[PDB]
């Protein structure tokens, strides 16, 4: 246990698996996507890794990532999401975290696939949230010019009322996902790693931590029906934006 | 108006299936997403 | 990203000086800007990464008839920051006319830091309402500020000026400042000098150095409002992300403040949540009910019990918040900030939209109404006449504040699906 | 002891006002998260919070309610109990059965508290102008208060001290079983969960107590917003309560040193003894 | 739940100050409100769980011509509680008219603590009968108190003012206070200054610091009355549960006090029960017989012998209590209170309904009768004339106290199945 946690440093990889892969850092993740918006709004056939890694680098040097160890920073590198035609600009981005040390046995390739899946769902949601706050930003910028309109006041006010329900629905889910999906699960996992006195004990808690988060969100085989309902709220937000 | 109606109806349909799915985890989400009990007065 | 802060008036310069000192005290830095050896966190939100490993705060200093500015000058916190931004009446009209002529040079002071910054996120205003020197000048500069940059946000830290009787021109000044405060500002955090004075006479026996202790209170509030931004958090690590959830209607943007310990000179989650909920820990003082509340907690907190805490505060059912569309009281949880000694660990701050401030607005409207009807207290000067010959700016502010009281009261109604 | 024998009273003084308005509704109108959440809020808010052995305190129900001892139209009014969960060597002492005996004691005592606060709510309603309802009110009050006090300072306190004495003298785990089953069996036996007919007179007496409190509260609220929608009802209730009270005194007089409950209940008296023996010839 | 206490007059402020000090001394707290390290019990019955882990007592202070209030001010028990409730004649009419004009602001003082409290259970009144400043003011505030909140209970701690001759207007004042004491109060604990003075001259040789030692006596009585509430008990852990059993008839609510040791500067159960039964340990002084007695015991008591004690006190057969409606002498047993040193362990307090107080009522009625017939001692003021021109309030109080003496005497009869 000692030689694996010091000569190949198992723990520091977990801390950057929450910050990077579980997107739990937040500063890096918003400033990155903030700088990544004009690329993703353009279609993805003319987007390549050459433009990914460097805007990542500008984000990295700006944010808290810069202080950290070069191993975990080297092991984050970009990937293109499963390239397939259709020009879906916002969909093509992904992180591939490469583990090729002795610690590969605790970070096997099948549970990194879970990291990719939860990253995908929490890419979609954090995209939609930013669309929503752009609507809210459009309200606070434009509407002090439309006080000189006696007729558009009605329809803009109707949009104000309808928007807050979207804001609410995209802030209740997003606090359940905060404080019970990546705060309670992180804690119980941190206990079950910090005590653990077998390689098996690390692995068999890691697996079920990932599975428990799959149960908390809507990505089960039975809760596909609920996920469809949740995707139908992703329809209306891009509708209202237009 | 029709967009508003459509959205409220489909989120009500989400909540009604939501109530009995998992034992605790998904059950708690129902109480998170509605305090006002608007969907007891729009049931 | 990067936020530029503004301070004007002697009271605003006092609260900004205390805020920068208090964040110097919080962060592991010297009063020269030198980093300490035990540092990490995000220190680009208001601090310029300056040229000698200095974290220089980015603060706009505006002063007229400098009295406190010399005291700020001869201090070891002028080695922390000195961007050379110093540029030299007691009426709103006088301050308005004095801001009129010198707007271009102070606008060069603005554009200097604007080009000096790579990114821009918002403008925070430290302004004292009816502060004499601050009044009029701050309103004019607020108008020019939102005129120039509609792509940014404005927050204004405001006091409610009345010590419950004094100066008879103050309701006119605060009314005109309130007109610009409505239509030229996007988020207003309002404070009460009466409520803060009452709490200061409550927890202690001081009533004479009230400004100095009120500086401590407002600096703690301003630091606690920004702790999720300055330290690595996850939500509302930008200003606009915080402002977005609280506002359902773009003129309902007035933010109420409370704080869970009252005296600052083991408890559980739902306890301090419930105590933050009560109005007697709210430090700003028919039905009046909250639109939406946001709360931040910072301290030693066991994180796994918060959902049962959430259930218990739900079924306690303390406020019948709103009719039409569903808001909530919404929690955020933060770590207690390191790099400094920490007493009174469990401390919470709440941001709320409440219609009860319409009562205070009707208070100052009634004061203006009686002073206008008596007509011996307008204190007719050539400044006010040359600014407005018919004094219809007061009429425009009056119909706008009427519209806002109407907005408050119709929002309190079950029907605000019709406008009013 | 703090919960089933109900030594913590403050917990219930808060809990019953905030709970019985929900309990009063019929069965399938209440759900376990509601009562569980109200109990958690009350428990941590109140002063019964000293140790983590209160987080096994849950809530459950009694469908078979009283017939089990050798109905269900309302839950919380005819079915209410607390479910504690034990550990493995404490499953060797306190089993499912013993917990159920604790609950069937606690349910009876729950009813005893409930009718008392029903009476206090009726008491403050007239804070009028009739001595007869004052005498009926005070009569039922004196009875039920004496019943409570008898149980608490005859059974509850001394046998708890007795069990604290027995286990100090235990030498093995076959002695602790004897001490425990003797404790539980004594506390059920001396209490009015005795006599395998369970004293139907007691159930009927508490029934007319419930009728008196309910109909008087309804009448007073209609009155604030007759001498035969007032006085005749008081007299009829007084007749039925007196008849069942004398039935209770007779069927307790055949029982039995444990006759001290009768001698305490009648200290001086007025019209609580009417005829010493009634019997028909041959 | 939560009980709000009231104190008015200098004597009432003295007894409340002593009560709060004596419960500070009983509980494991500092005189600042800080908890001690050896603490548990229920401390929400009169103590606000305040903001610095302070248990602040919830006490309404009312004062006119402040003399003792300054002495209360400069004390280390003003750091225990200070809710800022201080708000500034010797006649009942003068105190009535002075309470008349300022009722709204002291009612705001009431509503402040009313909204500050989450729950409400009752109002305890510390009022001195014919106390000069207290008289009239207390009667008016009692009237407004039961007018505003009919959903709560009122207890009033009262003295019988006569030192057996002095002031000639005192029977009028105590009579008008007694009228409100009957019809606007739901429970009255009456004390005798004569009986307490006699017992103080009995056990000791003091007769000059009588107020100071009487403070000790009343604070011990008030603490012993609330020990089952403040410490975890089982019955009458609310005020109303205590009040309910003692009152068979809603105007028979006058409560008699005794206490088993007389001097405070192994025995068995039935012993101290019998000694509490005797009238010479009763500290308040045709047939007169008890309606119903309740007693509380606190001390070192062997619990298993109480039923044989109950039998022995039964067959001793000391009082022939009542005809109609079976009452009883009713026991409650409590633990001796921890968290403080305890001398004179076995101590009992008895609450009883006895018709013997009708004798004291007839005493002051005879005093009023002779002073009214002589007609040189009414001391005609414009206050009394403007309050009542024909002085028929005295007539209304006179017929009501006649009805109460009739109620006492017909309750003593075997027939009270007919009213009278």
From Swiss-Prot, chain B:
Ubiquitously expressed. It is found in: Cytoplasm, Cytoskeleton, Microtubule organizing center, Centrosome. It comes from the Eukaryota. Signal peptide: none annotated. Belongs to the TUBGCP family. Component of the gamma-tubulin ring complex (gTuRC) which mediates microtubule nucleation. The gTuRC regulates the minus-end nucleation of alpha-beta tubulin heterodimers that grow into microtubule protafilaments, a critical step in centrosome duplication and spindle formation. Component of the gamma-tubulin ring complex (gTuRC) consisting of TUBGCP2, TUBGCP3, TUBGCP4, TUBGCP5 and TUBGCP6 and gamma-tubulin TUBG1 or TUBG2. TUBGCP2, TUBGCP3, TUBGCP4, TUBGCP5 and TUBGCP6 assemble in a 5:5:2:1:1 stoichiometry; each is associated with a gamma-tubulin, thereby arranging 14 gamma-tubulins in a helical manner. Gamma-tubulin at the first position is blocked by TUBGCP3 at the last position, allowing 13 protafilaments to grow into a microtubule. This is Gamma-tubulin complex component 3. It comes from Homo sapiens (Human). The gene is TUBGCP3.
Curated annotation (Swiss-Prot), chains C, E:
SUPFAM superfamilies: Tubulin C-terminal domain-like, Tubulin nucleotide-binding domain-like. InterPro entries: Gamma_tubulin, Tub_FtsZ_C, Tubulin, Tubulin/FtsZ-like_C, Tubulin/FtsZ_2-layer-sand-dom, Tubulin/FtsZ_GTPase_sf, Tubulin_C, Tubulin_CS. The keyword Flavoprotein does not apply. The modification Phosphoserine is found at residue 119. Phosphorylation at Ser-119 by BRSK1 regulates centrosome duplication, possibly by mediating relocation of gamma-tubulin and its associated proteins from the cytoplasm to the centrosome. GO terms for biological process: cytoplasmic microtubule organization; meiotic spindle organization; microtubule cytoskeleton organization; microtubule nucleation; mitotic cell cycle; mitotic sister chromatid segregation; mitotic spindle organization. It is found in: Cytoplasm, Cytoskeleton, Microtubule organizing center, Centrosome; Cytoplasm, Cytoskeleton, Spindle. The keyword ATP-binding does not apply. GTP binds at residues 130-136. GO terms for molecular function: GTP binding; identical protein binding; microtubule nucleator activity; structural constituent of cytoskeleton. Keywords: Cytoplasm, Cytoskeleton, Disease variant, GTP-binding, Lissencephaly, Microtubule, Nucleotide-binding, Phosphoprotein. Its main location: cytoplasm. Tubulin is the major constituent of microtubules, protein filaments consisting of alpha- and beta-tubulin heterodimers. Gamma-tubulin is a key component of the gamma-tubulin ring complex (gTuRC) which mediates microtubule nucleation. The gTuRC regulates the minus-end nucleation of alpha-beta tubulin heterodimers that grow into microtubule protafilaments, a critical step in centrosome duplication and spindle formation. PANTHER family: TUBULIN (PTHR11588). Belongs to the tubulin family. This is Tubulin gamma-1 chain. It comes from Homo sapiens. The lineage of its organism: Eukaryota, Metazoa, Chordata, Craniata, Vertebrata. The gene is TUBG1.
Swiss-Prot record, chain D:
Ubiquitously expressed. It is found in: Cytoplasm, Cytoskeleton, Microtubule organizing center, Centrosome. Changing residue 79 to P: In CDCBM15; uncertain significance. It comes from the Eukaryota. It is linked to Cortical dysplasia, complex, with other brain malformations 15: An autosomal recessive disorder characterized by global developmental delay, variably impaired intellectual development, speech delay, facial dysmorphism, microcephaly, and varying degrees of cortical malformations including pachygyria, thin corpus callosum and subcortical band heterotopia. Most patients have generalized seizures. Component of the gamma-tubulin ring complex (gTuRC) which mediates microtubule nucleation. The gTuRC regulates the minus-end nucleation of alpha-beta tubulin heterodimers that grow into microtubule protafilaments, a critical step in centrosome duplication and spindle formation. Plays a role in neuronal migration. Component of the gamma-tubulin ring complex (gTuRC) consisting of TUBGCP2, TUBGCP3, TUBGCP4, TUBGCP5 and TUBGCP6 and gamma-tubulin TUBG1 or TUBG2. TUBGCP2, TUBGCP3, TUBGCP4, TUBGCP5 and TUBGCP6 assemble in a 5:5:2:1:1 stoichiometry; each is associated with a gamma-tubulin, thereby arranging 14 gamma-tubulins in a helical manner. Gamma-tubulin at the first position is blocked by TUBGCP3 at the last position, allowing 13 protafilaments to grow into a microtubule. Belongs to the TUBGCP family. This is Gamma-tubulin complex component 2. The gene is TUBGCP2. The chain holds residues 517 to 876 of 902 of the full protein.
């Amino acid at each position: 246990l000692d030689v694996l946690n010091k000569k190949y440093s198992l723990l520091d990889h977990m801390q950057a698996m929450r910050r990077y892969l579980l997107l739990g850092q937040g500063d890096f993740i918003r400033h990155l996507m903030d700088l990544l918006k004009p690329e993703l709004v353009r279609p993805a056939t003319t987007l390549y890794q050459h433009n990914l890694t460097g805007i990542l680098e500008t984000a990295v040097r700006a944010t808290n990532a810069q202080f950290d160890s070069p191993e975990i920073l080297r092991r984050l590198d970009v990937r293109l999401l499963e390239v397939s035609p259709g020009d879906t600009g916002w969909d093509v981005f992904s992180l591939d975290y490469h583990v090729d040390g002795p610690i590969a046995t605790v970070f096997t390739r099948e549970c990194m696939s879970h990291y990719l899946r939860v990253f995908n769902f929490l890419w979609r949601a954090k995209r939609m949230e930013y669309i929503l706050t752009d609507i809210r930003k459009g309200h606070m910028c434009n509407a002090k010019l439309l006080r000189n309109m006696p007729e558009f006041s009605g329809v803009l006010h109707q949009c104000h009322i309808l928007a807050s329900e979207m804001v609410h629905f995209i802030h209740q889910m997003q606090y359940y996902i905060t404080f019970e999906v990546l705060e309670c699960s992180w804690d119980e996992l941190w206990n079950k790693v910090q005590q653990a006195q077998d390689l098996d004990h690390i692995i068999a808690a890691h697996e079920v931590f990932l599975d428990t988060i799959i149960s908390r969100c809507l990505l089960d085989s039975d809760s596909r029906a609920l996920l469809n309902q949740l995707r139908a709220v992703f329809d209306q937000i891009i509708e209202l934006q237009n | 108006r029709i967009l508003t109606h459509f959205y409220q109806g489909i989120v009500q349909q989400f909540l009604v299936l939501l109530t009995t799915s998992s034992d605790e985890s998904l059950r708690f989400l129902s109480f998170r997403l509605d305090f006002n009990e608007h969907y007891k007065a729009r049931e | 990203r990067e936020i530029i802060t503004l301070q004007l008036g002697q009271c605003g310069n006092q609260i900004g000086f205390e805020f920068w000192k208090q964040l110097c005290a919080e962060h592991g830095i010297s009063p020269e800007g030198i980093v300490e050896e035990f540092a990490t966190d995000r220190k680009d939100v208001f601090f310029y990464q300056a040229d000698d490993e200095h974290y220089i705060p980015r603060a706009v200093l505006l002063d007229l008839e400098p009295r406190v500015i010399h005291s700020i000058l001869n201090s070891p916190y002028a080695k922390l920051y000195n961007p050379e931004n110093i540029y030299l009446g007691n009426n709103w009209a006088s301050g308005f006319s004095q801001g009129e002529k010198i707007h271009e040079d102070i606008f060069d002071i603005i554009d200097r830091e604007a080009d000096g910054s790579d990114s821009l996120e918002g403008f925070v205003l430290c302004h004292s309402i009816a502060g004499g020197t601050g009044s009029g000048l701050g309103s004019y500069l607020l108008e020019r500020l939102n005129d120039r940059y509609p792509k940014k946000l404005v927050q204004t830290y405001s006091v409610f000026p009345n010590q419950d009787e004094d100066v008879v021109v103050q309701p006119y000044n605060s009314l005109l400042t309130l007109k610009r405060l409505t239509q030229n500002a996007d988020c207003v955090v309002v404070l009460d000098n009466t409520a803060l004075n009452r709490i200061a006479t409550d927890r202690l026996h001081i009533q004479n150095p009230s400004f100095s202790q009120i500086n401590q209170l407002v600096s703690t509030i301003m630091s606690a409002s920004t702790t999720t931004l300055r330290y690595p958090g996850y939500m509302n690590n930008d200003l606009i992300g915080l402002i977005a959830s609280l506002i359902p209607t773009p003129r309902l943007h007035f933010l109420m403040t409370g704080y869970t310990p009252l005296t600052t000179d083991k408890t559980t989650v739902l306890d301090v949540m419930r105590r933050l909920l009560q109005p007697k820990n709210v430090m700003v003082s028919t039905n009046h009910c909250y639109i939406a509340i946001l709360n931040i907690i910072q301290g030693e907190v066991d994180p796994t019990q918060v959902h049962k805490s959430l259930q218990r505060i739900r079924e306690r059912k303390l406020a019948n918040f709103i009719p039409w569309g569903p808001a909530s009281i919404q929690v955020a949880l933060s770590r207690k900030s390191p790099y400094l000694p920490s007493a009174h660990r469990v401390s919470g701050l709440m941001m709320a939209n409440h219609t009860s401030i319409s009562s205070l607005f009707e208070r100052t409207c009634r004061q203006y109404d009686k002073l206008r009807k008596r007509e011996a207290f307008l204190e007719q000067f050539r400044k006010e006449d040359m600014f407005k010959d018919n004094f219809d700016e007061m009429d425009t502010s009056r119909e706008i504040v009427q519209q806002l009281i109407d907005e408050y009261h119709a929002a309190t109604r079950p029907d605000y699906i019709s406008w009013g | 002891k703090r919960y089933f024998l109900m030594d913590q009273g403050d917990f219930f003084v808060h809990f019953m006002d905030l709970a019985e308005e929900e309990l009063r509704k019929p069965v399938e109108d209440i759900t376990p998260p509601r009562l569980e959440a109200l109990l958690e809020l009350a428990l941590r808010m109140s002063t019964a919070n000293t140790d983590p052995f209160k987080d096994d305190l849950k809530i459950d129900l009694m469908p078979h309610d009283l017939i089990t001892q050798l109905e269900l139209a309302l839950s919380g009014l005819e079915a209410f109990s607390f479910d504690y969960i034990v550990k493995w060597p404490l499953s060797l002492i306190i089993n499912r059965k013993a917990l159920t005996r604790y609950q069937m004691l606690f349910r009876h005592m729950f009813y005893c508290k409930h009718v008392e606060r029903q009476l206090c709510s009726v008491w403050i309603s007239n804070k009028q102008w009739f001595a007869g309802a004052f005498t009926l009110r005070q009569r039922m009050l004196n009875f039920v208060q004496n019943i409570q006090y008898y149980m608490m300072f005859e059974v509850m306190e001394p046998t708890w001290h007795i069990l604290e004495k027995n286990l100090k003298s235990a030498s093995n785990i076959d002695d602790v079983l004897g001490h425990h089953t003797g404790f539980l069996d004594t506390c059920l036996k001396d209490c009015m969960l005795t006599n395998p007919e369970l004293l139907k007179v007691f159930s009927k007496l508490m029934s007319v107590c419930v009728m008196f409190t309910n109909c008087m509260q309804k009448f007073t609220q209609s009155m604030k917003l007759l001498v035969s929608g007032f006085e005749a009802t008081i007299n009829k209730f007084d007749k039925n309560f007196s008849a069942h009270l004398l039935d209770l005194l007779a069927r307790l007089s055949i029982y039995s040193g444990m006759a001290s409950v009768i001698s305490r209940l009648d200290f001086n008296g007025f019209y609580t003894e009417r005829l010493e023996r009634l019997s028909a010839e041959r």
